[PDB]
């Protein structure tokens, strides 16, 4: 086609989706990770995670307002990945890398798994 | 903070949101523009348009599944802007520029209004 493109558009959309999340506006699911709860938008979760994409395209699970993650999942690891989904920013630190990598593998977030593997390999 | 950032993340999220729209997955509103209907995600509309941001933060309108636009709004102009919201790509042409600009003014999409004004000024 003969389209023009606004470079910052995708980043501006994501910033606004994060602002809606922070104000709990039109959030339609709560992700339960052991004792912790995280409110989010199903569409953002699906757009970022192979696991959520599978869950919310399921004819029964698409209608659930609560999703319980595997008890082995670390809430802080999930929190870091949820923030990444809404911001493109990953708070990767020596103290959380193992939990973040395990959570990203479970959530099927290949690019996060990739950088975790690379950061781990550099430290050995 | 000491975060790392994945450059293509925002673009990949938007591509997936557009894929969900094309397959009518978790769309929660229909925008009626005279004889035409457009299914979309309320959160994407709010993230792109000052008018939809106002509408879906309203305590009554947030719950509506159908939104009827002003009868003066051109469906093709709306279609072009809806595609832009989900892709960052604007199909701006001599034959549609006036309709696109009027629709963007109504929808409160300042960056689109700006490029329409600039393209019009260059042709006079």
């Amino acid at each position: 086609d003969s389209c023009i493109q606004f470079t910052r558009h995708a980043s501006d959309v994501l910033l606004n989706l994060n602002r809606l999340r922070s104000r709990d506006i039109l959030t339609d699911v709560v992700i339960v990770v052991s004792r912790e709860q995280f409110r989010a938008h199903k569409t953002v979760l699906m757009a970022c995670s192979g696991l959520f994409y599978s869950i919310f395209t399921d004819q029964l699970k698409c209608n659930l307002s609560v999703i319980n993650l595997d008890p082995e999942i670390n809430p802080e690891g999930f929190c870091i990945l949820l923030d990444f989904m809404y911001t493109s920013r990953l708070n990767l630190r020596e103290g959380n890398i193992m939990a973040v990598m395990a959570t990203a593998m479970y959530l099927q977030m290949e690019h996060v798994v990739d950088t975790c593997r690379k950061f781990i390999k550099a430290s050995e | 903070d000491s975060c790392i950032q994945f450059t293509r993340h925002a673009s990949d999220v938007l591509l997936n949101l557009n894929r969900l729209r094309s397959r009518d997955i978790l769309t929660d509103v229909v925008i009626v523009v005279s004889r035409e209907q457009f299914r979309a995600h309320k959160t994407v509309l709010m993230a792109c348009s000052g008018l939809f941001y106002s509408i879906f933060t309203d305590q009554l309108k947030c719950n509506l599944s159908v939104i009827n636009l002003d009868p003066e709004i051109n469906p093709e102009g709306f279609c072009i802007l809806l595609d832009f919201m989900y892709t960052s790509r604007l199909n701006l042409r001599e034959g549609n520029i006036m309709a696109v600009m009027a629709t963007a003014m109504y929808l409160q999409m300042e960056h689109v209004v700006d490029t329409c004004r600039k393209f019009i000024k260059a042709s006079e």
Binding site: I4, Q5, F6, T7 | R89, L90
Partner: peptide, 4 residues
């Protein structure tokens, strides 16, 4: 705005 750019030519993509």
């Amino acid at each position: 705005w750019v030519i993509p």
